[PDB]
Homo-oligomer: A and B are copies of this chain.
Amino acid sequence: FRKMAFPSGKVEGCMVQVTCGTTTLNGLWLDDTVYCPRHVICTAEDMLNPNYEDLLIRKSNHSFLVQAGNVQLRVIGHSMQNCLLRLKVDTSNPKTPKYKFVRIQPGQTFSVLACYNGSPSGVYQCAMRPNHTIKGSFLNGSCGSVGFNIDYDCVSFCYMHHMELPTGVHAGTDLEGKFYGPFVDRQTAQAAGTDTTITLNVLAWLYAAVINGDRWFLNRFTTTLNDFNLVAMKYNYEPLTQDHVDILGPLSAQTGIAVLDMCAALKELLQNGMNGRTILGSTILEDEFTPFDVVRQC
C-alpha cells in the first residue's frame, strides 16, 4: 500500500524563479501573477528584523527578476498579501491550469513539488502534522515550492514553503499568505510544539488493510469512545471526536466494520502489539493517509 503523489504536470508549468538582489527562491505563476514568499526581499541582516511594508513600498518593479526557464518576465506591479508577494508580470502563463486556493486542516494530506531555483526536482506526498508543520528534509532550500491536491481537472493549492524550524521540520502558508501554525517569516526564535499521531488516519489505514485482505487484527473486545481516547492519549495519539468518528462512516459502510469496532482494534494494537506480525506488510502503524486517500486508492 503506497504513498502516492498527484501527477505534477499541471503545477510544473507554473514554477518560476524570483530573485531580489542576492536572494532567489521559487514562485508560482498563475495568469499574470507570480506568488512567492515575501522574505525574498530580505538581506540576511533584514531577515532578523524585517520591515516588510517599508522594504516593499521602497523597492522598484525592475528590482525583481522573475525567470520562467531562461525567459525573463517583466514585473509591472508588486503588492503584499499577508506573507506572500503578489507580483504582476507582463505575460499570462500559457500553462495556467484550472485552480483554486484552499486552506487545509491538520492531519490532511497533499503533494509537494520540490523545486530548486524554479526547476522541478521531485514530488512527495505528505501530511500536515497536528502541530502545523510538515516532516521530512525534502524542502531544504526550496522556499516557494507549493503543496497541492488535484480534484479531477482542478489544482487546489494549499501550501507554500517558507522556512525550516530548528528541529528541521518545515513551516509555510496557505496561498493567501497566512501561516499554518503560530510561526512568522523572520529569522527568530520559533519552535514547533509537541506533535501527536493522527488517530483518524491510522484508523483509515486499518480500513485500507481490511480492504486489502488483512483481518487478523480485528477487535477481540468492545470499546467506548472515551475508554479509547484514554488509552490512545497514553501513546501520544490525538483524541478522536465524534465528528472524526463520523468521517470514517463511508469506510465503515464499505467494509462492514463499525467505527468503534476499529477503535477497539487500534486500542488493542497499541496495548498488545503486532509482535512481529505485519499489517499491509508493515510492522508499524501509518498516519499519513487520510480516510479520503484510502477511498480514492481502493
Is A283 part of the contact surface with B, judged by Cβ < 8 Å? yes
Instruction: Output the least CB separation between A12 and chain B (Å).
Output: 4
Q: Quick check: A1 and B284 within 8 Å, CB to CB?
A: no
Is there contact, CB below 8 Å, between A4 and B212? no
With the chains together, A145 CA to B179 CA distance in Å?
A: 38
Question: Is A124 an interface position by the 8 A CB rule?
Answer: yes
Asked whether A120 and B9 contact (CB < 8 A) given A135-B281, A212-B137, A284-B284, the answer is: yes
Bound CA span A136–B135, Å: 23
Q: How many residues of A contact B (CB 8 A)?
A: 28
CB of A113 within 8 A of CB of B212, answer no
Query: A7 — which chain B residues lie within 8 A by C-beta?
Result: 8-9, 12, 113, 120-123
Chain A 1-44 per-residue mask, 1 if CB under 8 angstroms from chain B, else 0: 11111111100110000000000000000000000000000000
**What is A's interface to B at a CB cutoff of 8 Å?**
1-9, 12-13, 113-114, 120-124, 126, 135-138, 212, 281, 283-284, 297
